[PDB]
Amino acid sequence: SGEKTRVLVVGGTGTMGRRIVRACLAEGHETYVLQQPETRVDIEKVQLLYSYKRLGARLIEASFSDHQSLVSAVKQVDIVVAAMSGHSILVQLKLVEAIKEAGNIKRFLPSEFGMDPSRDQKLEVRNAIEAAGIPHTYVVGACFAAYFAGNLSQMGTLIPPKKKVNIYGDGNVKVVYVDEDDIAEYTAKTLDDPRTINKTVYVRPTENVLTQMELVQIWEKLTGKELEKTNISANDFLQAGLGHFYHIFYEGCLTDHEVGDDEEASKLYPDVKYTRMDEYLKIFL
Amino acid sequence: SGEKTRVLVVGGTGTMGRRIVRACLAEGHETYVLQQPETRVDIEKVQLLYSYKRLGARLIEASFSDHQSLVSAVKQVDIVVAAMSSILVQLKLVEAIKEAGNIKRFLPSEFGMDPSRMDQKLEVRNAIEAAGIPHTYVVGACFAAYFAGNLSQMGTLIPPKKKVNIYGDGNVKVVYVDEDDIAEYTAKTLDDPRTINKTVYVRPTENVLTQMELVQIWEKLTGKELEKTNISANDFLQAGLGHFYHIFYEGCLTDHEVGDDEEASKLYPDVKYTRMDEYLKIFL
Ligand SMILES: NC(=O)C1=CN([C@@H]2O[C@H](COP(=O)(O)OP(=O)(O)OC[C@H]3O[C@@H](n4cnc5c(N)ncnc54)[C@H](OP(=O)(O)O)[C@@H]3O)[C@@H](O)[C@H]2O)C=CC1
Numbered sequence: 001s002g003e004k005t006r007v008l009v010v011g012g013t014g015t016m017g018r019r020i021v022r023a024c025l026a027e028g029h030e031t032y033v034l035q036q037p038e039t040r041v042d043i044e045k046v047q048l049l050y051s052y053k054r055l056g057a058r059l060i061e062a063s064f065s066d067h068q069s070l071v072s073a074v075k076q077v078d079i080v081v082a083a084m085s086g087h088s089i090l091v092q093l094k095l096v097e098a099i100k101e102a103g104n105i106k107r108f109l110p111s112e113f114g115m116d117p118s119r120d121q122k123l124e125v126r127n128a129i130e131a132a133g134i135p136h137t138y139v140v141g142a143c144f145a146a147y148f149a150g151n152l153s154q155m156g157t158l159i160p161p162k163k164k165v166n167i168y169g170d171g172n173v174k175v176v177y178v179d180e181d182d183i184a185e186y187t188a189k190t191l192d193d194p195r196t197i198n199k200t201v202y203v204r205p206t207e208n209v210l211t212q213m214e215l216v217q218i219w220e221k222l223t224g225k226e227l228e229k230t231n232i233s234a235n236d237f238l239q240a241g242l243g244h245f246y247h248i249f250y251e252g253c254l255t256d257h258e259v260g261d262d263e264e265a266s267k268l269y270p271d272v273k274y275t276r277m278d279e280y281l282k283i284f285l
Numbered sequence: 286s287g288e289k290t291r292v293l294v295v296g297g298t299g300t301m302g303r304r305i306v307r308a309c310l311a312e313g314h315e316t317y318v319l320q321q322p323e324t325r326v327d328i329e330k331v332q333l334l335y336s337y338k339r340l341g342a343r344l345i346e347a348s349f350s351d352h353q354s355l356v357s358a359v360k361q362v363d364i365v366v367a368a369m370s371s372i373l374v375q376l377k378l379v380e381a382i383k384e385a386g387n388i389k390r391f392l393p394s395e396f397g398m399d400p401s402r403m404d405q406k407l408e409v410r411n412a413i414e415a416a417g418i419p420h421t422y423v424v425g426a427c428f429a430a431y432f433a434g435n436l437s438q439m440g441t442l443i444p445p446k447k448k449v450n451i452y453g454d455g456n457v458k459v460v461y462v463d464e465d466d467i468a469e470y471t472a473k474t475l476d477d478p479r480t481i482n483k484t485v486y487v488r489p490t491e492n493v494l495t496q497m498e499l500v501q502i503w504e505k506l507t508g509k510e511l512e513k514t515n516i517s518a519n520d521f522l523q524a525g526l527g528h529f530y531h532i533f534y535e536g537c538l539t540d541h542e543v544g545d546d547e548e549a550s551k552l553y554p555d556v557k558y559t560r561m562d563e564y565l566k567i568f569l
Pocket residue numbers: 010011012013014015016017034035036038045064083084085086087088091111112113114115142143144145147148
C-alpha cells in the first residue's frame with residue numbers, strides 16, 4: 001500500500017522509457033511518468049502516456065524549460081529514472097538542478113544503458129549528479145538486442161539478413177546482447193536496492209556474452225541456412241555511431257573488464273529469467 | 286481451423302491499420318500483414334509488426350514497386366483491407382488484386398468522410414469498381430482521438446484546461462467514434478454478406494453529438510465549466526481546416542439519414558461501442 005517506492009520516469013514514451021514504465025509498475029512501484037507539453041498531434045506519444053494510467057501509473061505535467069515545474073514534479077516521488085534519446089542527454093542537467101533544489105530524492109538513475117562512458121555528455125551528467133551529492137545508480141554494459149541482435153549486428157536494418165552478412169574483424173570479439181525488456185526489469189529491481197546505491201551496475205547476463213560469429217551461428221542453427229560472410233578489417237572500417245560500433249566490435253569494450261557478482265545485474269537479481277538470444281531470435285523466423 | 290476468412294491488412298502499422306490487425310485477430314480471422322521494406326529501418330514499425338506474430342498473425346513481405354510480390358501476397362488470402370496515410374498507392378494494390386483473381390472482397394482506405402459527397406479515394410473507388418473487385422466502403426466517423434479527446438480543439442489531443450473554442454453555436458451534429466470500434470466494425474463487416482458492394486456507415490446512435498454536447502459531457506466529468514469563444518463560419522477563413530469546416534459547420538457527417546441495413550451499430554449490435562463519456566474518463 002504505502003510500502004511502495006515512488007518512481008518518476010523521465011522519457012517514458014521512448015523505446016527504453018516505456019519499458020521502464022512497465023517494468024516499474026510490474027515490480028510494484030508507485031509509478032509516475034513525466035508528461036511534457038509535447039502534444040503536437042503526436043498520437044503515438046499521447047496514447048502511450050494515457051495507456052499507462054489504465055495500468056495504474058500517474059502523469060505529472062512539467063516542462064524542461066520551466067525549472068519550477070520540474071522541481072514540483074520531483075517533489076512527488078522518491079526516485080527518478082531518466083531514459084532520454086541517446087540535445088537530449090544534456091537536458092538531464094536541468095533535471096539535476098531540480099532534484100538538487102527539491103532535496104527529497106533518494107536516488108537518480110540517469111540515461112545510461114549502454115557503453116560505460118567513464119571509458120562526452122553522459123560524463124557531464126555524472127559529474128553534475130556527483131557534484132550535487134545526489135545518490136545514483138549507473139546501469140551500463142549492454143548492447144540492445146533490437147539494435148544489434150535482431151539484425152545480426154548489421155547496419156541500416158533491424159531484421160536478419162536473408163543471404164549475406166558482414167563480420168567485423170574475425171567476429172571473435174565478445175559482446176553483450178541484452179533484450180531491452182530485461183534491461184528495464186534489472187533497472188526496476190536495482191533502483192531501490194541498497195546494494196547498488198552509488199554503484200555502477202553492469203548488465204552482463206552470462207549466457208548472452210557472445211561473439212558476433214556466435215550470434216550469427218545461433219541464427220544459422222535456427223534457420224538451417226549458412227550466410228555468406230564477408231570479413232571487414234579494422235582499417236576498412238575507416239560518423240560517431242560507427243565509432244560506437246568500432247569500440248564494441250573491434251575493441252571489445254563491453255567485455256574486456258571482468259565484473260564482480262556484487263555488481264552484475266544477473267547475479268544481483270537471479271530471479272530475472274533473461275531472454276537468451278536463441279529465444280530472442282525466434283520471432284524473426 | 287480452416288473455415289476462417291483469411292485477411293491481408295495493408296498499412297498495418299498505422300493508427301487504424303494496427304487496430305484493424307488486432308480486431309481481425311480478435312474476430313478469429315487468419316490474419317496477414319503486409320511487411321514493406323522501408324519498415325526495416327524503423328524500430329517502432331518493426332516492434333509493431335513482430336508483435337503481431339506473437340498474437341497469431343503472419344507477415345507477408347512485399348513491396349508496392351514490385352507488382353509480382355503484391356500478386357503473390359494477395360493470393361494467400363480471401364479479403365484485403367487497406368488503411369493508409371499514399372492513397373493512390375492503392376492503385377497498384379488493385380492491379381495486383383485484379384491479376385490474382387482470388388479476392389472475395391477489398392476494403393479500401395476509407396474510415397472518414399464519405400468522399401463521394403465532399404477525391405484520391407474516389408479515383409481508388411473507380412479503379413476498384415472498374416476491375417470488378419467486390420468491395421465495402423467503411424465511412425462516416427470522426428476519430429475520437431483527433432476530435433473528441435481534445436474537445437474538437439486544434440493543435441492538441443487532450444482536453445483543454447480553461448478556454449475552449451465553440452464552432453458556430455456548437456449546435457451541429459458530429460459523429461465521434463473510438464477508433465477501436467471502427468476497427469471492430471471493419472473486422473465484422475468484411476466477410477458479411479449483407480455489406481458486399483455496399484457503403485457501411487459507422488454512426489453509433491448515442492455518439493451523434495453536437496460539439497456543445499461533447500463539451501458538456503466533459504464539464505459534467507470535471508465539475509468545471511470552460512470559457513467558450515464562438516467562431517463564426519466567416520472567421521473560419523490548411524485543408525484540414527476545410528475538413529473541419531465541413532464537419533462542424535456544414536454538418537456533413539449528419540446531414541443525410543442512413544438506414545439500419547447500412548449502419549454499423551445496427552448491423553453489429555453486439556459491439557458495445559464506447560460512448561464519449563467513457564472515452565473521456567481516461568483524461569480525468
Ligand atoms: N545498444 C544500447 O545499449 C542502446 C542504448 N541506448 C541508450 O538508452 C537510453 C535511452 O535511449 P532511447 O530509448 O533510444 O531514447 P529515445 O529516442 O527513445 O527518447 C526517449 C525519450 O527521450 C525524450 N526526448 C528525446 N528528445 C528530447 C528532447 N529534445 N527534449 C526533451 N526530451 C526528449 C523524450 O521524452 P518523453 O517520452 O517524455 O517525450 C523521449 O520519449 C540512452 O541513454 C541511450 O544512449 C539507446 C540505443 C541502444
